[PDB]
Design a protein around this ligand. Sequence first.
Ligand SMILES: CCn1nnnc1NCc1cccs1
Lengths: 300, 237
Amino acid sequence: MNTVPFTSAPIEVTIGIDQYSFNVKENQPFHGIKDIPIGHVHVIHFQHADNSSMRYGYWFDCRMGNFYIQYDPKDGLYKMMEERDGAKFENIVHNFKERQMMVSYPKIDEDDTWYNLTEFVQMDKIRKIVRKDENQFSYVDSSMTTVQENELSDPAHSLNYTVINFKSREAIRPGHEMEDFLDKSYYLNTVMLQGIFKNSSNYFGELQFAFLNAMFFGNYGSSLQWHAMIELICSSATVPKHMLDKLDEILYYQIKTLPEQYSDILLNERVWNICLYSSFQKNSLHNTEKIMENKYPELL
Amino acid sequence: GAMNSSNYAELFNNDIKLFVDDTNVYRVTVHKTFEGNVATKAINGCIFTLNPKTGHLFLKIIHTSVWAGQKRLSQLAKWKTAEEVSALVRSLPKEEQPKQIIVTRKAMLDPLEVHMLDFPNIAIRPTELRLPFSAAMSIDKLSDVVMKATEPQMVLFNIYDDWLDRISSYTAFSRLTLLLRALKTNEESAKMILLSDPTITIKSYHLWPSFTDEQWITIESQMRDLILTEYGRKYNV
Ligand SMILES: CCn1nnnc1NCc1cccs1
């Protein structure tokens, strides 16, 4: 179990760690988060009490280094940094665990939620969507735009998700215009799965990462990307049976975890109704359809 | 964006544009089978592709053989339309290709956009106008060439005859849409108006009769009356 210490908490802030969150008061004696499960990526995220504008945060994996947070009063945010000196960090964090100035990552033992939400998400793929190679961790906020969003303006701060566009030459073989537009299997299996992603795990990884950035940061282009990747599967007549079964599990936990009061903005009526009721895969998503109907029957 | 009453004069500017109407592409007669079920029999159709500035009409005849062994024909018909319009554009010299294609029904937008991906600079536009181009098959010589076709065939017409020698494109289009609206609302009466007078003939190389300027005003007045009338006979006013 690993630890993300804080030098201090100078400004009042709601801190999130994965799907958990807690409030820290201005100059309250908070030194960090302990007992963070190893083996998963994590995200630590922030919303200042004074300016709820800009949720922001950091994707990280404690296996890739020792990471800590110090408030930068010039840039006005909590910054993640990597501590290179291992012995110093251990002496600093022990010192802190002894004074009990850390919140414990509050994982219930029965609970597989975070695993289920990050099953295919891998730091190495995050770092290709979020390009900042001098850091082992990845900053995301509310306002960052996607490569595709910029095509329709600062490139270094973009989310480099895989561009999906159903009315594009990439998606439509010459002479199979109608076939490929009404059945996207070519685009899914050959262009995207075989060509770009190499396998379904990488595809699901990006899909799950897009969802998490949409949910935790309200990042609109991430929400666009999540829905597009769902729609591309649901609109393909020919999908491997293992992908459909896994897709249903993935979406089930995403819908289960979504805050009830954000469903109005984070869920695209058109995509979901098409996917669950009109698409080729309308009968292949039993778990997701059941949770969607019992929790958001209004959307449908 | 969409074409409507507000930007109507754009039709007659010098940017090449085409209207595409697909109403008459997939045409059927519905009938009873021996067993008392219902079946359709397709008849020849056409794509109506019209330059509103010049009157040039690209009439792509859709022979019933193109439906043989196909399913979901009403959906296929929109993609076939889009395929044939794209093939037409590719066949035109670059300086004759449209800058815009306006579809008369919004269900053509995605089919045409997908078929025209190679032409990103050609705008595919809907319209809010309720244009009467479905009545094209009420023009005898157009109906005749469609029904007689034994194979896919493109036939070129000028749907304004020689009117542009004497009137503007705007006025020519208004005449065309009035004639077609009349034919669509009451075909028998509209044709009676157009041919009541034996002395006014249709030139071999024309579609409509050779009216003088004064006779066209009379004709146009009569067509308006017909449209208002039928609007009464329909609504009882
Ligand atoms: C009270 C903060 N402190 N106490 N002793 N050293 C430090 N530096 C802060 C940190 C550096 C790395 C992680 S936390």
